[PDB]
């Protein structure tokens, strides 16, 4: 009930942040068509 | 100081895409020239 | 060339569903920031 | 460009909390000093 | 999910310039009828 | 033609992005002077 360091606000901004990064991760694989673009998801599969 | 440097870097590889565009209209425009002299020389030769 | 492809690409089937889950989760993560920001309008109530 | 972002654009999500908590901030605020300008009016209760 | 520097933009649109590069490529073939057109994909072949 | 193409037309890919990127900033930019202007009412409480 104390203002001015609201706790829910950064729970769900760092929840939300978590989830852009995979909608943007799957959008790139949509767009380019491979499953391994970065290299980074898959080291031996690359 | 870094988000400066990292602009003019950007824009500086956005301008040289263009370099790189204009050089390969240049060499593909010479290439297709050359395709009518190679066939020209045939002609020649086949004529001798 | 078969094998190859097993391994690098990807297969729209499952890549869409994902795309589209994770869409309607970020709708929702949005929603529930909105509300977060709100959550706190109720003290005015006390000091007024 | 990516990399240039991180570094100098804002993140709405974090930005409209701050503001958003700012401003009740300053209605909080606005009340006290309200409240601590009349926090003087019992004087004149022992002048009368 | 910092606007004014979509980033997910300009990689989509990196990749489908890069496919449309090959599909113009392609259709290049189909039209002239050889493999070989601008002499810059085999040297020795040409 | 093409050289020349490469040179003066526009690509609707990147102008597309270019125009809907703008146009999200526009809309935030009004809010934000929408609560600029308002962000004085508070002095009112004080006088009030």
């Not at chain 3, 690098?8 to 869409?23: P, Q």
């Given at each position: ?6 706790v ?5 901004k760092a ?10 991760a799957?959008?790139?694989?949509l767009?380019?068509?491979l499953?391994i673009?970065?290299?980074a ?6 | ?5 990292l602009?003019?870097?950007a824009?500086?590889?956005g301008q ?11 060499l593909?425009?010479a ?5 009518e ?6 002609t020649?030769?086949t004529?001798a | ?5 097993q391994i690098?690409?990807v297969?729209?089937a499952s890549?869409?569903?994902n795309?589209s889950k994770?869409?309607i989760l ?7 920031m ?8 109720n003290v ?5």
């Amino acid at each position: 009930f104390r203002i001015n360091t609201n706790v829910a606000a950064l729970n769900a901004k760092a929840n939300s942040d978590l989830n852009a990064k995979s909608l943007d991760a799957s959008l790139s694989r949509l767009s380019s068509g491979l499953r391994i673009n970065s290299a980074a998801d898959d080291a031996s599969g690359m | 100081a870094i988000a400066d440097s990292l602009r003019s870097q950007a824009n500086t590889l956005g301008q040289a895409i263009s370099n790189g565009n204009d050089a390969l209209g240049i060499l593909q425009t010479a290439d297709k020239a050359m395709d009518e002299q190679l066939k020209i020389l045939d002609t020649i030769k086949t004529k001798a | 060339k078969a094998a190859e492809s097993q391994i690098r690409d990807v297969d729209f089937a499952s890549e869409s569903a994902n795309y589209s889950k994770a869409n309607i989760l970020a709708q929702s993560g949005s929603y529930a920031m909105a509300q977060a920001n709100s959550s706190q309008q109720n003290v005015l109530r006390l000091l007024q």
